Amino acid sequence: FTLNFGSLRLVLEMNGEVVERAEPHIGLLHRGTEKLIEYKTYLQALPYFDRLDYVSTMAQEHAYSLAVERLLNCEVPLRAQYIRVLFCEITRILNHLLALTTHAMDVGASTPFLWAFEEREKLLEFYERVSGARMHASFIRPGGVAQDLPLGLCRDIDSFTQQFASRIDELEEMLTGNRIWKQRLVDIGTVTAQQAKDWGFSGVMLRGPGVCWDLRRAAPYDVYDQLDFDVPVGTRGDCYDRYCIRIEEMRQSMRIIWQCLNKIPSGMIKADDRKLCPPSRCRMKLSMESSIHHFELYTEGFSVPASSTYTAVEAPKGEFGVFLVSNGSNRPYRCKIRAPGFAHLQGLDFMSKHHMLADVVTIIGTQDIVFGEVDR
Amino acid sequence: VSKAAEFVISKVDDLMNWARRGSIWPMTFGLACCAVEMMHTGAARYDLDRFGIIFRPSPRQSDCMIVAGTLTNKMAPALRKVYDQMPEPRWVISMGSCANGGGYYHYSYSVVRGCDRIVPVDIYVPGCPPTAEALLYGLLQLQKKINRRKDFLHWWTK
Amino acid sequence: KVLPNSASVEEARQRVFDFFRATCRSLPSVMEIYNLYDVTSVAQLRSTVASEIRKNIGVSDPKVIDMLLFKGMEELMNVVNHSKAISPFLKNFYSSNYF
Amino acid sequence: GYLRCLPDGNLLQTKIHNIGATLVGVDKFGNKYYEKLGDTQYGRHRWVEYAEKSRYNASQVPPEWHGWLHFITDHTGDELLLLKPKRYGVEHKENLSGEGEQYIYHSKGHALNPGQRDWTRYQPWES
Amino acid sequence: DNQFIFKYSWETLPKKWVKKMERSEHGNRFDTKTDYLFQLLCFLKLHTYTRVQVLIDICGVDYPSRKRRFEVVYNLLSTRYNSRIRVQTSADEVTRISSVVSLFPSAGWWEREVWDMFGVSFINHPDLRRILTDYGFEGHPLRKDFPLSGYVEVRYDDPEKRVVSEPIEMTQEFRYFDFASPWEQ
Amino acid sequence: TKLEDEQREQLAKEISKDWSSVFERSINTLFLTEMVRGLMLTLKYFFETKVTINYPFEKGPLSPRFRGEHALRRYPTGEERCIACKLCEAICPAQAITIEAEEREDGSRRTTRYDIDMTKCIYCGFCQEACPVDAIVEGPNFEFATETHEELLYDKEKLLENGDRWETEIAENLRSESLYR
Amino acid sequence: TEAYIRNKPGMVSVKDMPVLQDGPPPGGFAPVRFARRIPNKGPSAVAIFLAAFGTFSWGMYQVGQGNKIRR
Amino acid sequence: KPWEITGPCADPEYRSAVPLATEYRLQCPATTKEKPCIPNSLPETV
Amino acid sequence: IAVPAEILGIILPLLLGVAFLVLAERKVMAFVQRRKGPDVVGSFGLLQPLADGLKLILKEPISPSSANFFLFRMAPVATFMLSLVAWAVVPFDYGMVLSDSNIGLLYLFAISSLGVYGIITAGWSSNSKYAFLGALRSAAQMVSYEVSIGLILITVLICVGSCNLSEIVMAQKQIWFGIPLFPVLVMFFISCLAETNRAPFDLPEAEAESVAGYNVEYSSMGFALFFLGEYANMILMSGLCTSLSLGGWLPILDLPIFKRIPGSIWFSIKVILFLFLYIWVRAAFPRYRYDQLMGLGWKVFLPLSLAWVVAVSGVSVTFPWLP
Ligand code: SF4
Ligand code: SF4
Numbered sequence A: 001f002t003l004n005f006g007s008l009r010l011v012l013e014m015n016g017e018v019v020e021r022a023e024p025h026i027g028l029l030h031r032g033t034e035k036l037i038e039y040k041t042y043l044q045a046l047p048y049f050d051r052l053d054y055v056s057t058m059a060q061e062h063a064y065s066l067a068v069e070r071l072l073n074c075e076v077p078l079r080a081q082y083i084r085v086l087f088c089e090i091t092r093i094l095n096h097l098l099a100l101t102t103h104a105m106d107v108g109a110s111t112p113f114l115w116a117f118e119e120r121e122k123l124l125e126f127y128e129r130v131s132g133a134r135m136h137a138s139f140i141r142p143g144g145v146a147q148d149l150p151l152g153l154c155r156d157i158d159s160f161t162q163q164f165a166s167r168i169d170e171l172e173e174m175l176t177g178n179r180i181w182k183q184r185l186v187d188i189g190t191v192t193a194q195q196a197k198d199w200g201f202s203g204v205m206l207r208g209p210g211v212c213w214d215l216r217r218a219a220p221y222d223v224y225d226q227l228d229f230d231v232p233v234g235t236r237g238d239c240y241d242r243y244c245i246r247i248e249e250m251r252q253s254m255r256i257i258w259q260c261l262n263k264i265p266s267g268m269i270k271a272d273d274r275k276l277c278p279p280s281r282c283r284m285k286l287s288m289e290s291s292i293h294h295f296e297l298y299t300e301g302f303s304v305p306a307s308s309t310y311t312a313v314e315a316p317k318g319e320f321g322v323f324l325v326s327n328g329s330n331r332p333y334r335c336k337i338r339a340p341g342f343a344h345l346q347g348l349d350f351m352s353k354h355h356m357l358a359d360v361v362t363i364i365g366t367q368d369i370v371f372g373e374v375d376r
Numbered sequence B: 001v002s003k004a005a006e007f008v009i010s011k012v013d014d015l016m017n018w019a020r021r022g023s024i025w026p027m028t029f030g031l032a033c034c035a036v037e038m039m040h041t042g043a044a045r046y047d048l049d050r051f052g053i054i055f056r057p058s059p060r061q062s063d064c065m066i067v068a069g070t071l072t073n074k075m076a077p078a079l080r081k082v083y084d085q086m087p088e089p090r091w092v093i094s095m096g097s098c099a100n101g102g103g104y105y106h107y108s109y110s111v112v113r114g115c116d117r118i119v120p121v122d123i124y125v126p127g128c129p130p131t132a133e134a135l136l137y138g139l140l141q142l143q144k145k146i147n148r149r150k151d152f153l154h155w156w157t158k
Numbered sequence C: 001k002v003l004p005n006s007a008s009v010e011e012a013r014q015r016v017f018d019f020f021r022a023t024c025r026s027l028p029s030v031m032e033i034y035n036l037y038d039v040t041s042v043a044q045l046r047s048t049v050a051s052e053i054r055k056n057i058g059v060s061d062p063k064v065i066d067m068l069l070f071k072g073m074e075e076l077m078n079v080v081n082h083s084k085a086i087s088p089f090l091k092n093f094y095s096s097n098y099f
Numbered sequence D: 001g002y003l004r005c006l007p008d009g010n011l012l013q014t015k016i017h018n019i020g021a022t023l024v025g026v027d028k029f030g031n032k033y034y035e036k037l038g039d040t041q042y043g044r045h046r047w048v049e050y051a052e053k054s055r056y057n058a059s060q061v062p063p064e065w066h067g068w069l070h071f072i073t074d075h076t077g078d079e080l081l082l083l084k085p086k087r088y089g090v091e092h093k094e095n096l097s098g099e100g101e102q103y104i105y106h107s108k109g110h111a112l113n114p115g116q117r118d119w120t121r122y123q124p125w126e127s
Numbered sequence E: 001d002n003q004f005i006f007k008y009s010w011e012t013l014p015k016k017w018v019k020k021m022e023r024s025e026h027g028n029r030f031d032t033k034t035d036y037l038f039q040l041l042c043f044l045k046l047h048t049y050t051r052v053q054v055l056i057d058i059c060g061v062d063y064p065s066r067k068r069r070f071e072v073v074y075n076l077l078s079t080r081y082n083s084r085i086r087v088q089t090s091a092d093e094v095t096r097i098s099s100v101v102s103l104f105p106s107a108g109w110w111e112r113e114v115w116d117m118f119g120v121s122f123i124n125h126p127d128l129r130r131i132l133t134d135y136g137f138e139g140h141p142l143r144k145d146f147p148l149s150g151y152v153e154v155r156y157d158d159p160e161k162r163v164v165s166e167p168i169e170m171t172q173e174f175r176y177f178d179f180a181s182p183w184e185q
Numbered sequence F: 001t002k003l004e005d006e007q008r009e010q011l012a013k014e015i016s017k018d019w020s021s022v023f024e025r026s027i028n029t030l031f032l033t034e035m036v037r038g039l040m041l042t043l044k045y046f047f048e049t050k051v052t053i054n055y056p057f058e059k060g061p062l063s064p065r066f067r068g069e070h071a072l073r074r075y076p077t078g079e080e081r082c083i084a085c086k087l088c089e090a091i092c093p094a095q096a097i098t099i100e101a102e103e104r105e106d107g108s109r110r111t112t113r114y115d116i117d118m119t120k121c122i123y124c125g126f127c128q129e130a131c132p133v134d135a136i137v138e139g140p141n142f143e144f145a146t147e148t149h150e151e152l153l154y155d156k157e158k159l160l161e162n163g164d165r166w167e168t169e170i171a172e173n174l175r176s177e178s179l180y181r
Numbered sequence G: 001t002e003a004y005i006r007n008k009p010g011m012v013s014v015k016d017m018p019v020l021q022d023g024p025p026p027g028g029f030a031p032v033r034f035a036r037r038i039p040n041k042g043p044s045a046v047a048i049f050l051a052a053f054g055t056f057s058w059g060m061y062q063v064g065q066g067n068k069i070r071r
Numbered sequence H: 001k002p003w004e005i006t007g008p009c010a011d012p013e014y015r016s017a018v019p020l021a022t023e024y025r026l027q028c029p030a031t032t033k034e035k036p037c038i039p040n041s042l043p044e045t046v
Numbered sequence I: 001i002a003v004p005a006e007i008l009g010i011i012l013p014l015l016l017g018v019a020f021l022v023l024a025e026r027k028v029m030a031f032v033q034r035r036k037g038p039d040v041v042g043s044f045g046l047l048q049p050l051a052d053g054l055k056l057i058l059k060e061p062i063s064p065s066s067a068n069f070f071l072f073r074m075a076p077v078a079t080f081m082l083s084l085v086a087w088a089v090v091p092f093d094y095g096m097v098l099s100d101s102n103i104g105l106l107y108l109f110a111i112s113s114l115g116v117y118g119i120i121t122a123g124w125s126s127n128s129k130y131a132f133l134g135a136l137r138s139a140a141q142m143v144s145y146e147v148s149i150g151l152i153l154i155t156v157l158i159c160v161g162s163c164n165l166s167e168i169v170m171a172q173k174q175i176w177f178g179i180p181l182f183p184v185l186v187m188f189f190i191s192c193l194a195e196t197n198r199a200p201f202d203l204p205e206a207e208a209e210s211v212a213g214y215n216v217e218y219s220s221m222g223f224a225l226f227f228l229g230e231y232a233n234m235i236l237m238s239g240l241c242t243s244l245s246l247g248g249w250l251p252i253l254d255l256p257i258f259k260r261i262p263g264s265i266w267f268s269i270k271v272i273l274f275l276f277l278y279i280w281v282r283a284a285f286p287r288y289r290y291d292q293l294m295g296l297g298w299k300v301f302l303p304l305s306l307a308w309v310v311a312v313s314g315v316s317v318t319f320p321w322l323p
């Protein structure tokens, strides 16, 4: 018999409480993001990437800026690269915390939710101090960043890193090793590496089986090749090993954050050329050419050479890719948005096969489907 | 119509408004990317349980619908169906810009230009996303709005 | 299941017949889906479907025929899933300038 | 205002928090701004008592004290009042937004506006 | 970088279907015919030294000027040899191209998305229903000729006690700003 | 499943090396040691201090570079700071700003109409950073929830009065951030 | 001009311009203990089992004495 | 206290979650004791 | 006469205690989760239950029209009756009983047995089949864990010759039975946790999860009555736990400073500790799947309860330790 659930719509074929098959209906959050991006300039299209995969905000900005710089060939300063890495790892910590605690609530554990939200509130305070708003902060731009770090941010992040090491130990002690948690997670929605490769899994969902492949090491798109962090893999891909991988990724994100704080350089925050990066307020108010370039960059945009490329980054969900096709104009001709939730939600069908309803919700929580990015 | 019956009616209305204000049971309609900020509002810092707000998953037991996120043409019938099941004393809080006037996807197919076209919304919470501070401000504004409901007086003077 | 493009007019005609059969068999379900029994006239609905097929005869490309049949089957699935004397010139003239 | 604590419970929390606090300032609307350092967590070392116990609102904080209360600035409201601009400016007004049609903001084309302006961008012949 | 298996493919792949190749730092590109795309992807997926066994995604691009307006692009990855490859073809509105669901099971939803957005139908898809847009959607939104705001909009009709769909009558029309500079070329 | 069975047998042999280990494992699984530890941590957090913000009287920390409510400023003399350069809606990604202008009586370039939709603004600060004269600024105010969409549809007079009301805090934030520019 | 914006009272060349940005203090912060430290200092399995068994035995003896008194 | 018997609380290197107001965020961002100076170009390209 | 007065004085304070119990659950869970519970409706949220009840009363009802109107309406009535009549026997001190039945234990067991009918009829009378399936699941879980609870009652009945709770406590005078039978007390606590669908084993309250529940269709007062019945059962089984394994109205060590306390205060304090344990376990642990909890009830607690029955009987029969 068919059982319907109604922004997650899902129809399940059941025989004896055992899930024979599950079919999701996803379009409930379709918003025409690609069409709007085609209709808008690159800078005006950056907030669309802010909105996509909203739990991990600045990862999408990083991917979009990397694609634009690849199509544009502009050098980003070392300080901008380091602060981008720092905030990408902060974003990874935020997304992992939210995913783990929403999964725990769906399982039934309610209390770690608010502790991890206290941590997330600290991180969103970091976002709000460095940029405009707590969420959807258009901070990462092509060629660099919007603004420099406010003073004291590094010290506050160091204090947060220490207290957050304590918090991760705390959460792991409560959740890991619990008999109920183990019975909920182990041997639930297992995926072989061949199955993951066939269904196009990425990130934790792909390293859970143990393919032993990470994007930050295969194609280092930042100072990542100078940060000597660790990449955990799962012995037998299932919910428990994916959860442990997420915990280890939080720890390694803290490690990378400390390294970036320690070896952050002193310099500029964006690309040197004013044809591609807007000049400062003082420069545009004092210099004739700077005023011209500010006016042109805020009415028109930088005209990227006509080319097509696919740039992918290791978003906390997985591999987030943007396929940009240009025509030499100030607006992107085509922008395809490959999110690491579209493939995982396909994987739901075979993952939650011969399982039960609680196993289905556990698998959904483990895959961490954010519907904005799957409905891009 | 008198001055003592009016005082008694005012006291009864004040008691009713106090009860309805202190026992708001909103239901999340958590699409897009105001729902994460809503969960932040429900977190430890800007806690909602203090004021009486507790999220009821069943629309039949909920008091006011808080629509947070983008309303899609594919989801608007579901929103209306869920709204129709709510009890007659009911309110709507439209959080963000998508649910107010379409927000950042106003000029887009399959996007409802604000939840006002589907359900009668009482209070809009501007922001994108509105700070959890601002959403709790909107909930307090809902309390203030339902703090001036003279239901007993209106029933008496009919 | 989707099939390759029809390579012959006879194959396109057979596919059109199969689609018309599917519509006719799925007609009584639409009865309970929509509940317009007062003025439905199931025979009239069949006549209207035949009239649509007959007004779509000017097409001669088998690819266009197959695409039209695919869209018609999609529309059938949607309907099953319940998703809804002063001459012509003077009336438009009195209505608005843009006509 | 202490009798409001029994049916408020939130003013009760504020009064409990004003045990060891120091009154750092007061505004012209009556709001009393308190600071409390020492063994206090970061998020709860500055606050306000609105001096309107019945219907205190979150929008009653003037812009002069808004930043200090929200931890934007270390400057108290007195310095910002000293730095308040001249030759223009309006007094702080709360977010009424429902206290009356004569109080709320109306567009120039809204029927509730005292003066409603037509919008056609052409002048008819007007015989 | 990592242009190893691309060159090895061009050395070993049959030359019948390689319509054109592009060696770029933005991504190595193969453009072929729609008849031989399935065979080409089967060769790449199964060969021991070009093991692109994971399909990153399938995209569509609209080119109204060309005779075959639609361009179907396949981004694939080889984790064993650590390199990305791109294989694309050209399809028009009516012609159906081969489906690669059998090779890569993940291709089903991306192919449904391509159908939804452009109208390029696939030959051997297990199902090809719309995935992203509203139920009963009439057009293909990602076509260039498709208007940005669409053709219809929804609202609540009180007499019908349901949400009805009506032709668009939106206020504050989209303002297209022509920023293009005549000296950009 | 034969491989699974033999793996299970091998693991059972591995973790049953001696009677001490098997007895310890059985006692741990029977007496709920992990549950007791979780209860102890829960009790510690019950007895620890809370982080609730006490909303109406205590408000969360912010930054001078906060994107709250759109507003329009003025020069110290009193004239409108906003020339009609129309860089607002040229960069506004959501197209929430509509502006019309004409020459004033004394020949100055001023806007005769300037409205912003707060239901369409995404609160991104593109206009406030594209302003050549620092005329439009996204003010620190964010508690401006309205009961009506028409109220949320702002115009030039409302933006100007917001700027006049919040001029001092906006000026302080603008100084602090013009340092960071 | 960059020199005009970042002018120094007594600088001669465009180099050595004043600069002050967010960064580490001299010393480069402190280690933050990325790893986890969970100490298991609870009672041993044999100890709690012996405690439970002795408690059960002595409690049954006390139950017998109380039943005798009540009888 | 019962929670120091075992678990993370028993660890001597355990850090409290709540940050003190006197040590977490000393200077508000809009009032910093030292004035910033952010470079915008290399000295060569001036 | 005086019997209706006593019955009213038992019933109304029980409802007040249930209201303040849900308030205390909110407060304790919030304090666990580093936040503060209801504090804005009255001082420390003491008026929050009153505001909630008044709102529920003032909410306009809706009629599902399920062709089973009588059975739909009377199921929460049935469970409320069952909870109250179960509370009609529990003692509070020496002589504070309405019905001093010599078979008090079996009376409570029977009342617990009757408790499944309200939920079963609520699930059946609802139009939706999801509610019916959830009601069946909850009924089966209560069945299994009530079998376990009955075995624990048999253990206690082996320990104490009589069958009435007052004489049970009078036997508890010596050692409280919790010192001899702490594992039995733990198993009884988990069994009563699963009996009332509270803490782990929380199927009906997992509404955000796919299992849904039997209260989805119910209107304001139906849901309120079901909630009141569940929480009254929670307090009832906390009282059962303290009367069975903590001595009820008995002080510690029988010191004369401890005897100044009336004893009803002692019973209330023990019930409060058990309710705090209820909220503690609910807040601190995740929840079990339906199959997992059913297998655990039928394979872990039933054999252990039978083994403990046998062990206690063997210990008591062998030695002269028999009443
Ligand atoms: S209003 Fe802004 S924050 Fe809210 S859902 Fe829309 S895009 Fe996201
Ligand atoms: S902040 Fe952004 S969305 Fe709002 S008016 Fe300015 S440019 Fe437009």
Ligand code: SF4
Binding pocket: F081, F082, F083, F084, F085, F086, F087, F088, F099, F127, F130, F131, F132, F133, F134, F135, F136
């Ligand atoms: S950018 Fe500044 S000066 Fe230009 S229109 Fe906007 S507010 Fe006015």
